Design a protein around this nucleic acid. Sequence first.
RNA 1: GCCAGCACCUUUGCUGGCUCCGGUGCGCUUGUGACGGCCCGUGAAAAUCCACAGGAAGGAAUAGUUUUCAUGCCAGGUCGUACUGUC
Length: 220
Amino acid sequence: YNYKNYVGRLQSLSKTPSNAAPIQVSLGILATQAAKELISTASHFNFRTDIFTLLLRRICKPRISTDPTSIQIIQTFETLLNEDEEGSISFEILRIFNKILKTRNFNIEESVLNMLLSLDVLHDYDPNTKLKGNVSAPKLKKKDRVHLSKKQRKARKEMQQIEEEMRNAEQAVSAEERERNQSEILKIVFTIYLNILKNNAKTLIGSVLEGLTKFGNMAN
RNA sequence: GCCAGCACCUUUGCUGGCUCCGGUGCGCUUGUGACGGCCCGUGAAAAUCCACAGGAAGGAAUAGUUUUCAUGCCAGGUCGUACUGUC
């Protein structure tokens, strides 16, 4: 309840027509910074859609160069799209982005449109990529174990056998959902790019063609 | 178990002694104790036995209560079992 009220207040304060007193503009800027900082970890929580909507509305303004936070919000959105592999948060952001663009007749800054270039869901890598060197003790040593009762050991076995099948099912569900999210995001991105091309905005052509070249081979 | 002696056309067995004291191990077989190393779900389940918390209930005037102390009584059915012998 309190987080809902806080996010609603942040959204209300973010909307400032840049014509009121400078105190209100400062309030809106601080609210936008707070929302930008909050979404870095509260993305997997309730009412993330409101934060996404307010941040994208701030970004999708016709003039954002005077805004002292557009750089940071674009960086955060790019990081969110880059680190998201399953495609759930990416699709959630892209739906709102398309909804906002359709209202503005697809008129944004090339830089804004550049966030779609960082979509991890539309990227494919080597099946055997080398991750970072991560080292940990494989198993607790036998002579350094903690005593467990027979009932405790039986419960440990049961919960391990449950967890193994839960992990298998989780992997299967993630694999089957990534493909569908990828298809939906491809549809949305290609629709946005084609609408931009039909509008023929002289300041957005290069980014659009780069997006087509990057994501062209991921489609059907 | 090892001896010695005396009995018989026969189951023809009787008697007398000695069966003691030690040492040794990169030895073989096997059990076991404390460790050390590595793998790994803290490494099958159940019948079965025991204990612990808890404080219900019970206990006295011509045999109070309990009998995880001691002694004493009774019983233990069905099937396999001779012989040989891919693991």
